[PDB]
Ligand binder design. Structure first.
Ligand SMILES: O=P(O)(O)OC[C@@H](O)CO
Lengths: 249, 249
């Protein structure tokens, strides 16, 4: 027994009206019979197109980031802007942002808290690098990530929160994450939640796997006890994303 | 016998569908008899609405930022995506970016050269901080900034470039630069261009002034030999912007 899964496509900084339209079409046409929440995270630019086109009842739209408040922040998009715009899902704290864009544990927590406050469903991303991993630091980093988020949230807030564990150590480093290793990272998070906030919250909490997921390994990943679905990059831009939705039965 | 001016509205991180639409109906209503190029820079999110609704022949839409290449940059939007969407103008190197999100002289330079290679018209911001000004480093600060950009550009490239002089201490404070302060800044930049690139280039280059420009102060500003228009934040959210447009011929 598990909560409702989530299949999240993070298109990243990719796209084209043409291509996406076509993908959208494949998605709407998809027959989805179980209870799963599908999420499409498009560039900020694509959002309008995406909303108009996605008619599938099991799909919602999400943005790939935001700043907490409007103002003099050239190039940035804030929560209010998104709220007025009918967007209610957000991806926050993604590792690419953590790495290139100065996103500390603190900035992430703030952004999350800010989002929860304003009503958004948040997919917050945590996860360790090969360095931290190699040095025996997996636990300290992950728990420190989740603890930083957690100091700005009340028990009630949790219902607005989804966690994505990103195996950074396995991303673009040449290493392979196995299902066992994913599961362990997940169980760990769940332990902290269950132990810090509460058992009820813990059982309801969705922990997505945010590593390498393809149509062939997604079911074996799903088959693990603390895997609640996926946050997807590469295969999200492909028809394969369809098998990934299915793998959550 | 000054190059065609520019009145650029920098919305920064602000707006709602309702409010921007109003501004747009306002702009669409306004008649401008002189050779002037007006620019609206809105949030990525609002590019759609802007492009569909803005009908005035003297206006163009702009993006407030971008990165050079598509790929795995969660939260970002590339040049390729913008060009696919109909956007050919872009504001780069804004101080708010340099300050908050770590955009160094090199990073900006890279973004400019790229943008220029993709056929965009680019408004590149340079300017000094309160601190630098008080130290007497102004001339050094600005020449270095411009020089970083010049490095990556070839002579013909310049036909696509616009420089915006935004003294940081003047950004959204009410502390406008006086005409003398803005004209000595603008002349300095242009003497470097003529010296380094060529007199022709300097003669054609547009150098914009930003920093607390408003309906009232715009005229005198513009009256300066080396002032070719403005790049406006706060006042661009108001009907006042209309008066700013009128001050520039
Ligand atoms: O006109 P302000 O004072 O809002 O500042 C404007 C610029 O920083 C944007 O180009």
């Amino acid at each position: 027994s598990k909560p409702q899964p989530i299949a999240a496509a993070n298109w990243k900084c990719n796209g084209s009206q043409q291509s996406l339209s076509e993908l959208i079409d494949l998605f709407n046409s998809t027959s989805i019979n179980h209870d799963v929440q599908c999420v499409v995270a498009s560039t900020f630019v694509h959002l309008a197109m995406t909303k108009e086109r996605l008619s599938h009842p099991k799909f919602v739209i999400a943005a790939q980031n935001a700043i907490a408040k409007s103002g003099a922040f050239t190039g940035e998009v804030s929560l209010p802007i998104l709220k007025d715009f009918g967007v209610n899902w957000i991806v926050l704290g993604h590792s690419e942002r953590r790495a290139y864009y100065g996103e500390t544990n603190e900035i992430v927590a703030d952004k999350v808290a800010a989002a929860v406050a304003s009503g958004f469903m948040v997919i917050a991303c945590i996860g360790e690098t090969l360095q931290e991993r190699e040095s025996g630091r997996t636990a300290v980093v992950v728990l420190t990530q989740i603890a930083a988020i957690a100091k700005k949230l009340k028990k009630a807030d949790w219902a607005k929160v989804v966690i994505a564990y990103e195996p950074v150590w396995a991303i673009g480093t040449g290493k392979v994450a196995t299902p066992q290793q994913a599961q362990e990272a997940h169980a760990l998070i769940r332990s902290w939640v269950s132990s810090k906030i509460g058992a009820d919250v813990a059982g309801e909490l969705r922990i997505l796997y945010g590593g390498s997921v393809n149509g062939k390994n997604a079911r074996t990943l799903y088959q693990q006890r603390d895997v609640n679905g996926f946050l997807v990059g590469g295969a999200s831009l492909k028809p394969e994303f369809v098998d990934i939705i299915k793998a959550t039965q």
